[PDB]
Amino acid sequence: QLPYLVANVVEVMDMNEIEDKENSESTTQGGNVNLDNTAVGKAAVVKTSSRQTVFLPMVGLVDPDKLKPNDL
Amino acid sequence: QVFDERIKFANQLHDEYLVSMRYPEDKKTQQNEK
Amino acid sequence: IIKGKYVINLKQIAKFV
Amino acid sequence: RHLKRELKRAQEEVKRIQSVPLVIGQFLEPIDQNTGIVSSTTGMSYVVRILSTLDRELLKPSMSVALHRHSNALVDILPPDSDSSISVMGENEKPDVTYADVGGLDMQKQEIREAVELPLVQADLYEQIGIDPPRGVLLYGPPGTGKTMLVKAVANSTKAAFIRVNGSEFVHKYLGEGPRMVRDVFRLARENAPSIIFIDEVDSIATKRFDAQT
Amino acid sequence: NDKVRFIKDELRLLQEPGSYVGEVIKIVSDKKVLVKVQPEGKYIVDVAKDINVKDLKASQRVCLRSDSYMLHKVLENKADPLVSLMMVEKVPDSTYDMVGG
Amino acid sequence: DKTENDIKALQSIGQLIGEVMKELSEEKYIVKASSGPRYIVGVRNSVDRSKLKKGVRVTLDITTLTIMRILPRETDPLVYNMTSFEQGEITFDGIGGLTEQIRELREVIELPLKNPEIFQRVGIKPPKGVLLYGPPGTGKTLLAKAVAATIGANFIFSPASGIVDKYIGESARIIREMFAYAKEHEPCIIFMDEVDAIGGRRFSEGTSADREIQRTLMELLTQMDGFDNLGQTKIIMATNRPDTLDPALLRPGRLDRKVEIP
Amino acid sequence: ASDESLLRYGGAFTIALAYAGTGNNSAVKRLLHVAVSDSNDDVRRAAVIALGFVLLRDYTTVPRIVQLLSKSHNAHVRCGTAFALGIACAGKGLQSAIDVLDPLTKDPVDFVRQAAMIALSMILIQQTEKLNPQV
Amino acid sequence: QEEEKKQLEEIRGNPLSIGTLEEIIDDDHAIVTSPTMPDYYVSILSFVDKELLEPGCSVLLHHKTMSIVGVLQDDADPMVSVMKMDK
Amino acid sequence: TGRDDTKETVYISSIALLKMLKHGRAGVPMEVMGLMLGEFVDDYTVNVVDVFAMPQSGTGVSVEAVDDVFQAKMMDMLKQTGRDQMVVGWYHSHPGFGCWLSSVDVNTQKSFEQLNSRAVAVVVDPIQSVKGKVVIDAFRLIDTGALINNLEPRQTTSNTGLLNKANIQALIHGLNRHYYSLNIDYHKTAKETKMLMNLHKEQWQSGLKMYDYEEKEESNLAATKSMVKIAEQYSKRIEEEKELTEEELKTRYVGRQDPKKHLSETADETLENNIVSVLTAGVNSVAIK
Amino acid sequence: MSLQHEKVTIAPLVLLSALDHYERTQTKENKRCVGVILGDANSSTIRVTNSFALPFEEDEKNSDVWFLDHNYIENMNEMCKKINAKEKLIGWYHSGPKLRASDLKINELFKKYTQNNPLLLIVDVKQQGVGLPTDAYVAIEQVKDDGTSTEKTFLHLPCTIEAEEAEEIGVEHLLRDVRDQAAGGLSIRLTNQLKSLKGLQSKLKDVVEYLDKVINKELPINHTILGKLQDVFNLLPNLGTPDDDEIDVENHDRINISNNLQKALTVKTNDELMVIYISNLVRSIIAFDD
Amino acid sequence: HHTDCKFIRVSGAELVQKYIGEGSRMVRELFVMAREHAPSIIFMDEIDSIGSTRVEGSGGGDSEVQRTMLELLNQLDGFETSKNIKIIMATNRLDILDPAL
Ligand SMILES: Nc1ncnc2c1ncn2[C@@H]1O[C@H](COP(=O)(O)OP(=O)(O)OP(=O)(O)O)[C@@H](O)[C@H]1O
Ligand SMILES: Nc1ncnc2c1ncn2[C@@H]1O[C@H](COP(=O)(O)OP(=O)(O)OP(=O)(O)O)[C@@H](O)[C@H]1O
Ligand SMILES: [Mg+2]
Ligand SMILES: [Mg+2]
């Protein structure tokens, strides 16, 4: 429910599905076995009308198919 | 050994700095010049 | 107008529901 | 001995203020040894305390400086090397041009070693003669001539520091983005003296007409 | 003792809540001052004890304390508009020896 | 579980992207945030120092401001519309009669693309740059859709004036970032499409708009020729009259072949 | 020995009264050491006040001893200094005693101001201005 | 003077945050746009004379919730300096 | 006589403090909240033994974002573990703003004040607790009518306290028009001290463990060179340092930062560093074989 | 289950909270508080962020007889998500002074709810240890190659801490000690230097008497322990190596730096000696003038 | 240097202006800066090559601004007693000035 900012999606870039022993990340990290070290899952960078960008592990209720790389 | 000796000489020079330096400081608080 | 919330643009430029 | 251990806890206190996070300003000018004016790169001017036994020789000229992100105070400094516009390209990379791949413009070839090559090897040549060394070099002409190429020839040849900036790397994007990046390139060059600055084009920066309407 | 206990006094100084630089456009003799804040808007706002409106005057840069933008002290350096003209131009002075002949 | 997944994402917080502007020490880095202003930050141990280079995108924390991880390159939202342009595709010979111009186009574009090596023997600067000009309706652009389809190389494409912003030098940054993307990409074809107002001259007895033209133009000159010289990323420039263009956009050695399609 | 500040705060005064009006180095040593060495502000403040009580009798030595403590800019230390001089020189005033209090009316911390004002009036209770020009 | 200013300062700052008077509404409100870029649908205290203020006036808004605290008559522009005399 | 309200000081057990910080920073900038479990004894002591967090919302604090259903389940969880006492209030964390109650927060507080009058609101700033100070301030609502009658002086009777005002601006508005702020003391036991002070397993592994001796040679090289530059600067200064007025000499012959002082700090750090390092080498070499 | 582990990182909160819960069940004298352990895992480093009590009864007659209230554990976990949806079971804490053999049978029960082998974190309430007052084990089942059957056994891992910065300053705020077991000046690290050597003595004693206990009181000849002991000797120096001669050359080097640094300090203070004399020298005139 | 004037070099430029940004409103304010920083010299050197249509426009658009300056100057010998602000104008030849100057 309201209120909540409305932003645009820079991109979907996506970090690997979490079943790995070695993080879950496309861009691999130092240290041996990770899962919730600084490994997080599917990633969306969104660009705001608060004039910045943020990398989040996004909600899995909504698909990276329901995310376009320019979707509001 | 040689380095050990030099250091002690330096330390004793500090001690001689200490006894001399603060001794006349005390005297100026004691005397009237205010 | 979204049929049943609205998308406003503030005068702050910042867009909200 | 207590006062000594109490020093360590006091200095410790001050170290937490020093440590990150920080924000980056620029030091303008002093008004005291414990007060200065700083412009943040959040595009705001603050009159700010100057922390104890931090530089006051370098600090007084314009220079990057560390400020606290919440408190807003001068809590650390940043050297004239760091907080670059972009690093040197004359001791890290080397240009793709020398004067074995320059052909003509022999008339300008006599002129470019006067200006560039002779002050790097010994700036004192001009001074002991008693002639002033020229200031900046303008290269001008109809596009294609090899002006830009010539800079590369003498920068690869002399083998002292170089800086590749342009006017689209001083360009405004945020507030106080723009004035700051100009200042940044000269402070870099001075630290790694001597150095050659090339700003590739000023046809966007200096314009014979300004509207000054906006 | 002096060395260690100024540091304790200095933590207050370092943990200031911000400042700003303003310039006084004009006073108003209601005991308040019109300040065109330099990065910011215009606010008419209360003076401190340290300064007063007859010691405050137009084209004098001030320091403000961001507790409410409370005018604190005069700022020693202020802008001169003539220096804007002459500096951005850049023009030395000469004597009559550089017209000689 | 579909709603359980929603809780674990919701209780996480965001992160703020930067890029490594400059090493200060070894445990402190200067980043330039995507919110704008530069900060001084520390690092998590998970990121290695020698994977921290300058121009590498990092996460920061948004309450501690510390790198947790390296992030892939950022990329424009706009250039994801541009790879979604190749529609209007047609066969190798899809403009009839101007077939002689297709052959002439591939000399510059496709022959060094597959093998740059046949030009090593020859010894010339790798063929880069094409200007297309004609009276409208001759498929300067229809040809571009054919040479995107047939080769099957990475393709972009630019709207006319939708890569012109309201910020001077922000409309430079965008076009700068599509060139970078195109150099990361193998054999990329870069079509500038109907450049006629985004290639104007000096004017500036006009409005403030013509200084947006001028800022954005200077960016092209450095890219084409500087320490970037393209040998696998290719420039194709389409214009409707080739004296709308400033003569550094009519300068060969950035535009080696200037092809007229009549 | 108690790890409780309140029990230590009373401990200072327990010295004050056991060894009241005899200048014993042991009583005085424990107070001086606790005062400097502790981090719980009540305890430190108490300890200096205890000094004046031990040394009621030798009230002449007090300003020389406790000038050290007033020098420290810790608030509670300064506050405890003020009362101790108050206590020692209450019946008979000393010039030096009064001076150590004078920059404690010019300290900006008000707790230090409260103590110092009371101490000064404790030393100068019915003293006139042709008897002490500082009155 | 003394008792009138008590309740004058009640509804006055600290900051007095200049606005630009875009349009009036006749219910004791106006839409101002500030120099600092957020709009406010301001009230009007109703001692400064409700309709004595017109578009292009510069308005004093309160440090908290914005009411038109008062109204400044005259705000010296350098553009009427040119016309106006100095000699 | 009526009921008189007077000073209190909110004692945040070591446990309670870590939980608020952990929960609050983690959830920032979204608002975080939770209830404070504890007990009131005395008339000057609010003792908060524990806190927990109540589920976050993207409506932040609200009177209906408190959520009593969740409170009730949680209370029974403490009841079965024998830890329930009395909920002594609520805390909430403002993100990077100061400690002051929002207008909405005043009405959240008005609800808990009905249920127990001694309830507090504890406003936390987590992004400001990464200084050398932790910034936390406490409020407790006072009757609007009482403030009219001049009963803010009533709240400081029978001690001088440690009275100080750490924050004004929105704070002093809300105090004036609603609340009486409380100062904060910390409780902890002698057991808990030992737990807190201990933070390394390498306590006994740090004077037998050593750093690479290439790194030490680099360090000695760096140190000696730095003091060599500062000495030339000092030498320029001490060509005079003999004219009237210290301040004139400091400007003219740079005693800006005092190269005497500057050299002392640098000398003393590397000198102390080398004595440990030699001592570590000599212990291990002789003792181990 | 993760069968890969390396270290256990512990938040400070965990330790303190188990001591609080311990006194409020009023446990002592072989009645020991046991609660659940919450945190991150599927990670070689076990990162323990929080802990909570469970309703638990320990019989002191038999510790193989115990009560665990299983139903409560599911309800509590749903409220853990309310706080933060990234906390799950990764073991269980023990509050006792040391490891019990009834702890292996207890560990079985938490396997059901963990995606990682379950952790035993002994939170002492007497705060022993010369490092942290926590010992750490994780239960592993393995073949033993000594001719003995497959055990499930608690194998030791290092203990470390990961503290949030926000929390850590609360530790400093609370703590009024100026720290003598952590780095500081020369004297402070001079204690730290002696402290480490005295730590080695205590640890070195325990091995000697364990070895005596094996061949007279007949404790298992455990090859894995003794193998690490063989490597202690092989990694131990021998007098007359040119590496240990280089140590002599390297001693000279840093001591000489101290020697020059000591001279540098002596110079600087002799400047202040002369200053103060110039201050006395002026103040003779001022006194004489008055 | 000898008169003790501020030497203000003006060039018909808008670069020195970045708070009025046209030379047609920067006469009165330009004048008033010279009066504050009296005594003063406005060296309006008209080059008449600024722009590329403004010297077929009116023979120099600098000469257009100069006419403003000089028209003020018709009363400047009495306002507060006696010119301090000399307008020292300069040009390449006196014949390439309009005869209204
Ligand atoms: N005079 C020259 N002789 C040989 N090569 C030349 C000459 N001038 C330019 N070139 C070549 O043209 C290419 C680009 O030149 P560059 O863009 O560096 O400078 P420029 O000719 O001043 O261009 P412009 O003025 O059009 O921006 C290079 O490969 C360079 O070698
Ligand atoms: N050469 C052609 N053969 C077949 N269809 C054509 C041709 N030229 C144009 N068309 C038709 O017109 C449409 C739009 O023309 P298009 O944009 O390709 O022309 P253009 O020459 O690039 O013009 P401009 O110079 O104005 O951009 C095509 O997609 C196609 O449907
Ligand atoms: Mg060029
Ligand atoms: Mg087309």
Residue numbers in the entry:
A (entry chain M): 74 to 145
B (entry chain S): 459 to 492
C (entry chain H): 105 to 108, 144 to 156
D (entry chain K): 73 to 286
E (entry chain J): 52 to 152
F (entry chain L): 89 to 350
G (entry chain N): 541 to 675
H (entry chain I): 89 to 175
What does the paper say about this structure?
The proteasome is the most complex protease known, the primary ubiquitin-dependent protease in eukaryotic cells, and a well-established target of anti-cancer drugs. Ubiquitinated substrates are first recognized by the 19-subunit proteasome regulatory particle (RP), then translocated through a channel into the proteasome core particle (CP) to be degraded. In budding yeast, two deubiquitinating enzymes reside on the proteasome: Rpn11, an integral subunit of the RP, and Ubp6 (whose mammalian ortholog is USP14), a nonstoichiometric factor that binds the RP reversibly. The proteasome activates Ubp6, whereas Ubp6 inhibits the proteasome through deubiquitination and a noncatalytic effect.
The S164R T166K double mutant (hereafter rpt1-RK), which has lost ~97% of its capacity to activate Ubp6, was chosen for further analysis. S164 and T166 fall within a segment of the conserved L34 loop of the Rpt1 OB domain39, hereafter termed the activation loop. Cryo-EM analysis of the Rpt1-RK proteasome together with wild-type Ubp6 and UbVS revealed that the fraction of proteasomes in the si state was reduced to ~25%, whereas the conformational profile of the Rpt1-RK proteasome alone was comparable to that of wild-type proteasomes. Thus, the Rpt1 mutation impairs the Ubp6-dependent transition of the proteasome to the si state, although Ubp6-UbVS remains docked at Rpt1 in the s2 state proteasomes that are observed with the mutant. The mutation also conferred structural changes on the associated Ubp6 enzyme: Ubp6 was slightly shifted from its position on wild-type proteasomes, and the activation loop retracted from the ILR. In summary, a modest perturbation of Rpt1-ILR contact interface can decisively alter the conformational profile of the proteasome as a whole. In both activation of Ubp6-mediated deubiquitination and the noncatalytic effect, the rpt1-RK mutant phenocopies ubp6-AA. The highly specific interactions that underlie proteasome inhibition by Ubp6 are exemplified by the ILR mutant Ubp6-AA and the Rpt1 activation loop mutant Rpt1-RK, both of which dramatically impair the noncatalytic effect even when ubiquitin has been chemically engineered to dock into the Ubp6 active site.
